[PDB]
From a paper:
In this study, we focused on PEP as the target of potential inhibitors of the Streptococcus quorum-sensing pathway, established a reliable high-throughput screening system using a synthetic substrate for PEP, and successfully obtained a compound that was found to allosterically inhibit PEP and suppress the quorum-sensing pathway, which eventually led to attenuated biofilm formation.
To address this idea, we tried to resolve the structure of MuPEP1 complexed with Compound 1 by soaking and co-crystallization methods under various conditions, but the diffraction data revealed no bound compound molecule. In the crystal structure of the original MuPEP1, this pocket is occupied by residues from the adjacent protein molecule, which would explain why the complex structure could not be obtained. Therefore, we prepared another form of MuPEP1 with the four N-terminal residues truncated (tMuPEP1), a form that was found to be crystallized in a different space group from that of MuPEP1. There are no other significant differences in either the overall structure or the catalytic triad residues between the free and complex structures of tMuPEP1.
Numbering used by the authors:
A (entry chain C): 6 to 24, 38 to 140
B (entry chain A): 6 to 140
């Protein structure tokens, strides 16, 4: 589960992306979903974004890994990486150096998750 | 329910901002809120709406909620919500009230403007992010 951690309080977008700062745009308020999409396009990846709910993790034909837009307190533009699910838990990567790859409850992820999932494939 | 429509492909953020700051008197040009909210080619981010609304003399609180939020009658309308509309992954609405199983929303889209919307459709578009602001 190779995850590249964040450094600045703004590079969360790029940080999930790699797992660059200018390609999306990333400015002071972090990246916008459209920015992640655009930047992933430039890098030779097909992208489809979807608005989903928890049933997305019931699907067996889900192509991991992918990006999710999440809200952490007042990090209203946060992003995770989703590598898989196991039992009733998710394996996610948080660019936040204090978190990185973690087991996370499906409940907790539901509380943070926008429903925005960005899928990419070459 | 007054609503400042969007013109540019990017100004949805600024447009909901003006549309609300208008409700408590203040009038601002979209070209300016654009600058305050740091809106670029890729629209505004929730942080942009928050910062800009503060700068405009508003105490603001953002929250992550679900539809149960509208089962609380002492909800103070109006407020801004982050929604997903098609490829418009950053769209925003104004929420003016609720009546029946339906909400009254303001969509800066000149073709939409103020509209009633079912609880279901709004649930499908909505992030859960609600931005409440007060002078």
């Amino acid at each position: 589960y190779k995850l590249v951690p964040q450094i600045d309080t703004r590079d969360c977008g790029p940080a999930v992306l790699a797992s660059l700062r200018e390609l999306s745009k990333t400015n002071k308020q972090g990246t916008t979903a459209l920015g992640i999409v655009e930047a992933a396009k430039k890098l030779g990846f097909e992208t489809r974004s979807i608005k989903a709910d928890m049933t997305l993790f019931d699907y067996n034909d889900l192509t991991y890994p992918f990006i999710v837009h999440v809200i952490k307190g007042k990090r209203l533009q946060h992003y995770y990486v989703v590598y898989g699910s196991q039992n009733n838990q998710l394996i996610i990567g948080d660019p936040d150096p204090s978190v990185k790859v973690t087991r996370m409850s499906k409940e907790r992820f539901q509380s943070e998750w926008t429903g925005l999932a960005i899928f990419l494939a070459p």
